[PDB]
Symmetry: C3
Subunit: 124 residues, 3 copies
């Protein structure tokens, strides 16, 4: 079972490249990292920085996540990234993406590895 940390690396790390090589970059990446295996992940971002650099962000500026959790951290400096967003016509199994390169700060959610149960909140 791939861990969440491992899956983050497969889905969002692309350290061997400095920017998107072309407009088709997202079509080739979404596919090779298996993000189109059984559905078209709608939107996905790849970071062109070293793993050490993205990992250090868990020690940078704390910010609340879009969902409210308090384990999100924003990078102190900008990083090269590529957003991949499914086009209007894309329909599994014919997933199509638009590639958008940019250089912005990133926000990642962090957790211990492993992350296990320690309290029983309730049953619903």
């Amino acid at each position: 079972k791939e861990t969440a940390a491992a899956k983050f690396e497969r889905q969002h790390m692309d350290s061997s490249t400095s920017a998107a090589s072309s407009s088709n970059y997202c079509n080739q990446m979404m596919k090779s990292r298996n993000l189109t295996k059984d559905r078209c992940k709608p939107v996905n971002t790849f970071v062109h920085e070293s793993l050490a650099d993205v990992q250090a962000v868990c020690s940078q500026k704390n910010v609340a996540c879009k969902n409210g959790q308090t384990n999100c951290y924003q990078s102190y400096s900008t990083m090269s990234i590529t957003d991949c967003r499914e086009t209007g016509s894309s329909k599994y199994p014919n997933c199509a993406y638009k590639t958008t390169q940019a250089n912005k700060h990133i926000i990642v959610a962090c957790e211990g590895n492993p992350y296990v149960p320690v309290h029983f909140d309730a049953s619903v």
Copy 2:
């Protein structure tokens, strides 16, 4: 000094059984899992699923925690559980419980393991 993860297992996991086999299930389990040694724990639920299944809930749907932390996750599917609630006359050293078998989504709070001090927030 039992770890919090091991304590959750002792207090909440009963994998070897599919459901409560009797109404005295709670009196027997609260006693054998040492939940009546330090006082009568008022309420406690046991999950009849694999350690793998329960551990995977830490990666399922994030939901609000009754205590306000942002580390609660609800299981995508229902699981067989056994709620143990102290009877009206229960009182240490004669703890007694009502057994209620059910099928419900469970909500557990998750944490890294080990889970250590990383910042000094304040003194009070």
Copy 3:
């Protein structure tokens, strides 16, 4: 690369001393613990308790952190600690601190180890 757990032990743990052994303790300590290498850290506290005693706080009373994060806990018992506040005259590389012994409850922020990225939340 020093871990976050390790950096805490180095900046806030002083287990070999039951309390500030002199009013020059902060001046010595702030230097020996490298909190004066690049600049003089404004304020810092040391906890005169074993490491286990402090690690045990991650299981104690959950209280909000100064920044709103929900991973802070307050010790049930008060502890022997030392506040080090930089004197207004202090100017790097001449770091002068005012030492102040105290017996207070400590509040620490806790995380898993390792603590790594698991979701890409946004780019700002």
